Design a protein around this ligand. Structure first.
Ligand SMILES: C=CCOC(=O)C1=C(C)Nc2c(c(=O)[nH]c(=O)n2CC)[C@@H]1c1ccc(C)cc1
Length: 113
C-alpha cells in the first residue's frame, strides 16, 4: 500500500534521529520505569507515558495515519516531564533543549498542501 505521508517520512528519517542524537536525550530514550528510577507517584500523575523508542517503533510500523498524531506524541513526552518535575530541575532544562530542537526541525518539515 501507499507509503506514509511525506511529513511522517520526515519525522521518522530526520526529526526522530536528531532528537535521539542530542546529548540530552538519554532520559527520554526508553519508557520510564518509575520504580527502578525512584520516581514516586509517576504513574498516578502521568497517564500517557511516552518516549522516543516508542515513537520510533510507531513510525516504523505505520501506527500513525498522519503527522499531527506523531507530533502530539513527541509533545506528550515533553509535557510529561514538565508536569511531573519542577521548574529549576535539571531534567526540565534537558526536555526544554530537546523541545527547542524539535521545534527547529518541525519548522524545516515540508509543508502540506
Ligand atoms: C535513579 C534514577 C536517576 O535519575 C535518572 O536517571 C532519571 C531518569 C532516567 N528519568 C527521569 C528522572 C527524573 O527525575 N524525572 C523524570 O521525569 N524522569 C523521566 C524522564 C531522573 C533524572 C534524569 C535527569 C536528571 C538531570 C535528573 C534526574
Amino acid at each position: 500500500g501507499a507509503a506514509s505521508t511525506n511529513q511522517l517520512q520526515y519525522l521518522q528519517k530526520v526529526v526522530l534521529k536528531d532528537l535521539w542524537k542530542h546529548s540530552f536525550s538519554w532520559p527520554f530514550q526508553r519508557p520510564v520505569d518509575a520504580v527502578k528510577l525512584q520516581l514516586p507517584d509517576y504513574y498516578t500523575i502521568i497517564k500517557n507515558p511516552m518516549d522516543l523508542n516508542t515513537i520510533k517503533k510507531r513510525l516504523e510500523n505505520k501506527y500513525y495515519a498522519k503527522a499531527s498524531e506523531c507530533i502530539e506524541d513527541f509533545n506528550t513526552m515533553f509535557s510529561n516531564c514538565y508536569l511531573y518535575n519542577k521548574p529549576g530541575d535539571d531534567i526540565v532544562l534537558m526536555a526544554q533543549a530537546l523541545e527547542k530542537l524539535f521545534m527547529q526541525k518541525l519548522s524545516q518539515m515540508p509543508q502540506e498542501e
